[PDB]
Write a protein that binds this ligand. Structure first.
Ligand SMILES: [Mg+2]
Ligand SMILES: [Mg+2]
Ligand SMILES: [Mg+2]
Ligand SMILES: [Mg+2]
Ligand SMILES: [Mg+2]
Lengths: 266, 265
């Protein structure tokens, strides 16, 4: 893979460059899930006193020639190499390495070995032992209640703008409630490790039954398809709620969802 | 009388008589002349510093509600028992100074309708700072970010699509759609509705671009997803050919064409 060649380049450069103290890889190439369609992604930790004016534009071209480079909304350097492989590079001071422990709240990290690319002082290796084996429990009454409330809120807002005739806006809201729906399916089916990245591997991770029901909650920009998608997403959530009520105390009840159902006609 | 106007009246009544409340500010469509039967209601409630308060008790006094939670942004969101949606921020009076920053997020046509209650006169003072104001979205910085962000998300979305991660590509497509709407609004110079880029879209962009945008949408289906991604790129190619004449752009026609060629690769 071209991306494994780029990874080896990153490993080579981060170890030899005096400006760089540590390098941590994340994403699919750290979990055995990388393929030809994958990106590459790293945190690059810099010597504190040169962090501000670090020439990332030049350094990244030293990794490989690129077509395009920009800083995204979260302050990550995002690159498209001339071979069309995407790379995400988060440049921070060595002193901000203390953000690493918070990564234990973000997902399943069974192994940490592929994450350590370079570690000058030993401190990256210690931070990673803090997150190794992390596995947040998503199957909580708090998640189920937040998701059902959020869904009801988004669904009602979406149906309102749809009734108004704001079709594009109801479509945008529909995509937000789809994300909510995936997390709920993952709760109902107890396959919730892919939590923030809820659509990742969906085709391999959920029952055909719920996958098809989810497919029915999608729509193109068209009034009839939108009304159909909204009704189906409420019907799906009604199914998910009757399952989740067996294991959690829910503030959103069938009678509340029933009020939303009757509203579509009004 | 709209159900929301009776609720607004109740909010006015309660905030002006409660000793714990220093000020009340309304925002959204009912302060922009766009409120209707499908609208929600929304307010910042500013509290005496020492008591910053049980919101659920107070909100029940506005009207009985079916559900109340805090959204991902810390806002209290309520569905009243007549199905009207309300969004309430409870903050200390000392946070009233966030008000001048509102001119950074959009056009402020009517600060008179925004003032619900103002014990000290300070709310009116902050509001007068933002009256008539709006950001100018028509910049090289915006065109560059959006074209770059689009290309990033498009390449990522097309990759997961080729992998056969259909639901993931659909999620990314909706992120692309938002970028595309901002780009259309730049190209057509109608950019007030920026953060809320879908707002009044049917009324605010040309029919030609609306129909092009409609072709960038898909259901959860391989064929429809490929069609949407292709059309997404072709629309952006149209847009940057307009944008290149006004701004110096990092994303060139040649780059977009390499992306177009990649669809079949
Ligand atoms: Mg990745
Ligand atoms: Mg990535
Ligand atoms: Mg509103
Ligand atoms: Mg609102
Ligand atoms: Mg009471």
């Amino acid at each position: 893979l071209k991306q494994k060649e780029l990874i080896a380049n990153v490993k080579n450069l981060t170890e030899s460059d005096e400006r760089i103290t540590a390098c941590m890889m994340y994403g699919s190439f750290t979990k055995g899930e990388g393929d030809q369609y994958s990106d590459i992604e790293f945190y690059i930790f810099l010597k504190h006193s040169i962090t501000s004016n670090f020439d990332s534009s030049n350094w990244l071209f030293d990794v490989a020639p690129y077509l395009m480079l920009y800083k995204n909304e979260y302050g990550t350097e995002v690159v498209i190499f001339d071979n069309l492989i995407r790379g995400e590079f988060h440049f921070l001071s060595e002193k901000d390495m203390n953000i690493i422990p918070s990564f234990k709240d973000s997902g399943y990290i069974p192994d940490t070995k592929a994450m350590l690319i370079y570690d000058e002082t030993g401190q990256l290796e210690n931070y990673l032992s803090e997150i190794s084996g992390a596995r947040p429990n998503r199957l909580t009454e708090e998640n189920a209640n937040f998701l059902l409330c959020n869904f009801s809120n988004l669904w009602l807002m979406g149906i309102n703008v749809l009734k108004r005739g704001e079709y594009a806006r109801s479509l945008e809201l529909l995509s937000q409630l789809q994300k909510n729906t995936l997390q709920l399916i993952r709760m109902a089916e107890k396959n919730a490790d892919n939590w923030l990245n809820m659509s990742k591997n969906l085709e391999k991770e959920i029952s055909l039954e719920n996958y098809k029901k989810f497919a029915k909650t999608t729509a193109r920009l068209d009034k009839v398809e939108l009304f159909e998608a909204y009704k189906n997403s409420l019907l799906l959530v009604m199914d998910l709620q009757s399952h989740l009520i067996e294991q959690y105390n829910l503030k959103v009840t069938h009678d509340i969802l029933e009020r939303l159902l009757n509203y579509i006609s009004e």
